[PDB]
Amino acid sequence: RTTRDDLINGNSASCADVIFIYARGSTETGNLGTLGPSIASNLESAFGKDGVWIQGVGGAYRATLGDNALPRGTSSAAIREMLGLFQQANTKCPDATLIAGGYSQGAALAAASIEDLDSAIRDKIAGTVLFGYTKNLQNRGRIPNYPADRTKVFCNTGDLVCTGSLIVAAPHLAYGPDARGPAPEFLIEKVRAVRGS
């Protein structure tokens, strides 16, 4: 459901081929919130339940609404949490292909963490999806230090956070269809591009 800790819980003698690290939006529950479970179910269908590990960003990431106003669009403690999960993936399962995503504050968090990541780990992230990306205007639709071809941004018309504001309007809450279809589609395609079939 809304909490998945497959990387933390997983046996390193039986690593998955694909590890997905996902950060939820402000005020959302568990470590996957509203969109993450939808993405996860579609990744399990493509790779098999034992072929993919789903890991939400929990721990120090409290998804507090006010932290959207901080410099990087989230807290330093949250960035450290997400960086630590990428590092854990790299150490536990060195041969796994990584994929990532985030919604709202979680999109800012994914972007900041990927910017700060050691390059050798960053380069293992085959694709990243961002919904309601609160730094979309500021970062010109990119994740710093990360290629555009591996990035997919979902920013609805009328979602004010995508145009430089912090006001939450109805289109910000309308990413369900993207999470069910085009987002997992993109992630699956980017994994298959590097792993084959």
Rounded distance between C-alpha atoms, residue 154 and residue 145, angstroms: 19
Of 67, 113, 172, 178, the active-site residue reads: 172
> Where do breaks (C to N over 2.5 Å) occur in the chain, by preceding residue number?
none
Q: Can you give the CATH number for the domain in which 51 is found?
A: 3.40.50.1820
Of 67, 75, 159, 178, the active-site residue reads: 159
Q: What is the resolution of this structure in A?
A: 1.0
**% helix / strand / coil in the chain, to the nearest 5?**
45, 15, 40
The reply to whether 104 belongs to the active site is yes
What is the 8-class DSSP label of residue 49?
T
The reply to whether 172 belongs to the active site is yes
Instruction: State the residue range of the domain holding 4.
Output: 1-197
Helix 182-195 / helix 36-47 crossing angle, nearest 10 deg: 40
Other Cβ atoms within 10 Å of 197 Cβ, number: 5
Expressed in angstroms, the distance from the first to the final Cα of the chain is 28
Of 67, 104, 113, 178, the active-site residue reads: 104
The reply to whether 159 belongs to the active site is yes
Give the count of domains, the chain: 1
Helix 76-92 / helix 105-116 crossing angle, nearest 10 deg: 60
Give the determination technique. Answer: X-ray
Other Cβ atoms within 10 Å of 160 Cβ, number: 16
